[PDB]
Design an enzyme around this catalytic site. Structure first.
Site, PDB file in Angstrom:
ATOM      1  N   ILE A  36     -13.254  22.620 -17.349  1.00  0.00           N
ATOM      2  CA  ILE A  36     -13.748  22.098 -16.161  1.00  0.00           C
ATOM      3  C   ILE A  36     -14.548  20.552 -16.087  1.00  0.00           C
ATOM      4  O   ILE A  36     -15.014  20.077 -15.236  1.00  0.00           O
ATOM      5  CB  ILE A  36     -14.839  22.983 -15.768  1.00  0.00           C
ATOM      6  N   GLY A  71     -15.027  14.004 -20.931  1.00  0.00           N
ATOM      7  CA  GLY A  71     -16.103  12.873 -21.237  1.00  0.00           C
ATOM      8  C   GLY A  71     -15.431  11.784 -22.530  1.00  0.00           C
ATOM      9  O   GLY A  71     -14.418  12.298 -22.897  1.00  0.00           O
ATOM     10  N   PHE A  75     -16.240  11.889 -25.629  1.00  0.00           N
ATOM     11  CA  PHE A  75     -16.096  12.409 -27.130  1.00  0.00           C
ATOM     12  C   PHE A  75     -15.763  13.891 -26.856  1.00  0.00           C
ATOM     13  O   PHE A  75     -15.872  14.479 -27.890  1.00  0.00           O
ATOM     14  CB  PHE A  75     -17.324  12.060 -27.635  1.00  0.00           C
ATOM     15  N   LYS A 128     -20.182  22.756 -23.848  1.00  0.00           N
ATOM     16  CA  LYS A 128     -19.506  21.300 -24.190  1.00  0.00           C
ATOM     17  C   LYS A 128     -19.200  20.992 -25.498  1.00  0.00           C
ATOM     18  O   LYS A 128     -20.185  21.576 -26.462  1.00  0.00           O
ATOM     19  CB  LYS A 128     -20.721  20.454 -23.650  1.00  0.00           C
ATOM     20  N   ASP A 145     -28.709   7.205 -16.675  1.00  0.00           N
ATOM     21  CA  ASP A 145     -27.318   7.367 -16.227  1.00  0.00           C
ATOM     22  C   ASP A 145     -27.422   8.370 -15.041  1.00  0.00           C
ATOM     23  O   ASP A 145     -26.442   9.318 -15.011  1.00  0.00           O
ATOM     24  CB  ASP A 145     -26.521   7.612 -17.285  1.00  0.00           C
ATOM     25  N   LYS A 154     -26.485   9.711 -11.594  1.00  0.00           N
ATOM     26  CA  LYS A 154     -25.205   9.449 -10.726  1.00  0.00           C
ATOM     27  C   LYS A 154     -24.681  10.870 -10.208  1.00  0.00           C
ATOM     28  O   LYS A 154     -25.053  12.032 -10.853  1.00  0.00           O
ATOM     29  CB  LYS A 154     -23.912   8.687 -11.434  1.00  0.00           C
ATOM     30  N   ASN A 178     -23.459  13.651 -12.243  1.00  0.00           N
ATOM     31  CA  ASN A 178     -24.411  14.264 -13.221  1.00  0.00           C
ATOM     32  C   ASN A 178     -25.246  15.062 -12.281  1.00  0.00           C
ATOM     33  O   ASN A 178     -26.618  15.863 -12.933  1.00  0.00           O
ATOM     34  CB  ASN A 178     -25.336  13.435 -13.874  1.00  0.00           C
TER      35      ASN A 178
HETATM   36  C1  LIG Z   1     -21.294  10.763 -24.697  1.00  0.00           C
HETATM   37  N1  LIG Z   1     -20.894  11.897 -23.842  1.00  0.00           N
HETATM   38  C2  LIG Z   1     -19.587  12.531 -23.808  1.00  0.00           C
HETATM   39  O1  LIG Z   1     -18.720  12.020 -24.231  1.00  0.00           O
HETATM   40  C3  LIG Z   1     -19.225  13.777 -22.667  1.00  0.00           C
HETATM   41  C4  LIG Z   1     -18.542  14.725 -23.276  1.00  0.00           C
HETATM   42  C5  LIG Z   1     -18.266  15.678 -22.193  1.00  0.00           C
HETATM   43  C6  LIG Z   1     -18.701  15.667 -20.896  1.00  0.00           C
HETATM   44  C7  LIG Z   1     -19.386  14.762 -20.420  1.00  0.00           C
HETATM   45  C8  LIG Z   1     -20.019  14.627 -19.199  1.00  0.00           C
HETATM   46  N2  LIG Z   1     -20.229  15.827 -18.566  1.00  0.00           N
HETATM   47  C9  LIG Z   1     -19.455  16.456 -17.611  1.00  0.00           C
HETATM   48  C10 LIG Z   1     -19.614  17.540 -17.066  1.00  0.00           C
HETATM   49  C11 LIG Z   1     -20.914  18.568 -17.607  1.00  0.00           C
HETATM   50  C12 LIG Z   1     -20.934  19.794 -17.048  1.00  0.00           C
HETATM   51  C13 LIG Z   1     -22.086  20.465 -17.418  1.00  0.00           C
HETATM   52  C14 LIG Z   1     -22.398  21.842 -17.041  1.00  0.00           C
HETATM   53  C15 LIG Z   1     -23.418  22.771 -17.520  1.00  0.00           C
HETATM   54  N3  LIG Z   1     -23.382  23.883 -16.724  1.00  0.00           N
HETATM   55  N4  LIG Z   1     -22.562  23.820 -15.932  1.00  0.00           N
HETATM   56  C16 LIG Z   1     -21.680  22.694 -16.164  1.00  0.00           C
HETATM   57  C17 LIG Z   1     -20.524  22.739 -15.291  1.00  0.00           C
HETATM   58  F1  LIG Z   1     -19.400  22.198 -16.098  1.00  0.00           F
HETATM   59  F2  LIG Z   1     -20.284  23.682 -14.839  1.00  0.00           F
HETATM   60  F3  LIG Z   1     -20.688  21.364 -14.311  1.00  0.00           F
HETATM   61  C18 LIG Z   1     -22.886  20.140 -18.495  1.00  0.00           C
HETATM   62  C19 LIG Z   1     -22.507  18.666 -18.988  1.00  0.00           C
HETATM   63  C20 LIG Z   1     -21.620  17.997 -18.523  1.00  0.00           C
HETATM   64  C21 LIG Z   1     -21.295  16.571 -19.022  1.00  0.00           C
HETATM   65  O2  LIG Z   1     -22.003  15.961 -19.705  1.00  0.00           O
HETATM   66  C22 LIG Z   1     -19.743  13.586 -21.345  1.00  0.00           C
END
Ligand SMILES: CNC(=O)c1cccc(Cn2ccc3cc(-c4cn[nH]c4C(F)(F)F)ccc3c2=O)c1
Length: 380
Positions: A67, A70, A72, A90, A183, A185, A188
């Protein structure tokens, strides 16, 4: 005594991380010619593999759906097999974080989600690792993000008042822990099962001096949302305060009410240049139909820091006339009804998320690629 403290660097989880991490970085045929390395491995290699099976590990989860993505890694909707509970997990790729000299942003991200204990911050239940990835096991937000919400509704100003207020309170809470987000937005801003907001992705956060400031010579964040002072800090010795988050709230409010971001350009360098020239480039479309109060708050956020609303504290944001409303108060907004309540089919309903579409080389000498990740494991 520190061994029990989940904040201490020498608790049991961190001590196990080191032992595990040493065996990982030494167990290669070339390094085993050293007798010291082989004598240690023989003593500890069988029980380490046993420890590996009993530690929380990835195979303990069913992967239901991806879902999020990012730079990394990715975020997966998972179900824990033994307990049948549902989370968002994550992943961060160790190879990529090393390959791109970016190996330390996740400490504050893990610590905020683990210890904030705030309704405004997504909570972390477990952090663990294997030789490839970092894992952060988080409460799932089935409501989706505000990019998805904006793509499905025309947001009236009444909704915009609600989400802007919730963001302001969330950022204030993060500021009171001593952190600047940097950050902010809509990607987020996540929505929970009741339609209320939580902040996520704390990868670019920074703790303030005892004076409330940060030194930084590196522009960070996302190009549409980056404030002038942070952008200007790339050329050396930036000294700025939490007010850079209020600039990004201004961009968000513009985008919700107008339909585009205020410094849009076809190139990144164009966006960078427009932001610098903001006193001249900020222009509302002729057909906007936005109230005088909303336009006044947007323009009070989208200025230079010395003049920006919020530089004196959050009270001057809260009294602004744009927030006059007949549904909620600043002290009870999260206990009132959200503008959009999600209709959820199952505990793994993922309908508010769009669908989504290498390793270290074998070492010749000790490299210690696992050393930066010691102490990441955490058990609530
Ligand atoms: C340097 N950073 C990176 O490389 C990086 C790696 C992977 C993702 C991201 C950005 N991102 C995107 C969606 C996301 C979703 C949730 C989350 C928490 N609870 N539920 C969800 C839900 F998914 F349901 F929305 C928490 C954190 C993130 C999140 O960080 C960044």
């Amino acid at each position: 005594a520190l061994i029990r403290d989940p904040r201490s660097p020498i608790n049991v989880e961190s001590l196990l991380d080191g032992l595990n991490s040493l065996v990982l970085d030494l167990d290669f045929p070339a390094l085993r010619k050293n007798k010291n390395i082989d004598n240690f491995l023989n003593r500890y290699e069988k029980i380490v593999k046993k420890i590996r099976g009993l530690q929380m590990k990835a195979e303990d989860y069913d992967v239901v759906k991806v879902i999020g993505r990012g730079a990394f890694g990715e975020v997966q909707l998972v179900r824990h097999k033994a307990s049948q509970k549902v989370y968002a997990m994550k992943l961060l790729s160790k190879f990529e974080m090393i390959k791109r000299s970016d190996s330390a942003f996740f400490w504050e991200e893990r610590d905020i989600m683990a210890f904030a204990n705030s309704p405004w911050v997504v909570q972390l239940f477990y952090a663990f690792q294997d030789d490839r990835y970092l894992y952060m096991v988080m409460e799932y937000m089935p409501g989706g993000d505000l990019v998805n919400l904006m793509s499905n509704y025309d947001v009236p100003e009444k909704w915009a008042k609600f989400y802007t207020a919730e963001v302001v309170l969330a950022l204030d809470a993060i500021h009171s822990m001593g952190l600047i987000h940097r950050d902010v937005k809509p990607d987020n801003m996540l929505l929970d099962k009741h339609g209320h907001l939580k902040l996520a992705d704390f990868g670019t956060c920074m703790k303030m001096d005892e004076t409330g400031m940060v030194h930084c010579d590196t522009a960070v964040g996302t190009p549409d949302y980056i404030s002038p002072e942070v952008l200007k800090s790339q050329g050396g010795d930036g000294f700025y305060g939490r007010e850079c988050d209020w600039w990004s709230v201004g961009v968000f409010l513009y985008e919700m009410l107008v339909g585009d971001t205020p410094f849009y350009a076809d190139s990144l360098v164009g966006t960078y240049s427009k932001i610098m020239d903001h006193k001249n480039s900020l222009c509302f479309p002729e057909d906007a139909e936005i109230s005088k109060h909303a336009k006044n708050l947007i323009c009070a956020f989208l200025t230079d820091r010395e003049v920006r609303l919020g530089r004196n504290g959050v009270e001057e944001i809260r009294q602004h006339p744009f927030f006059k409303n007949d549904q909620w108060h600043w002290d009870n907004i999260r206990e009132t009804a959200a503008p959009v309540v999600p209709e959820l089919s199952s505990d793994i309903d993922s309908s508010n998320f769009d669908d989504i579409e290498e390793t270290f080389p074998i070492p010749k000498a000790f490299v210690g690629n696992q050393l930066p990740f010691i102490g990441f494991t955490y058990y609530r």
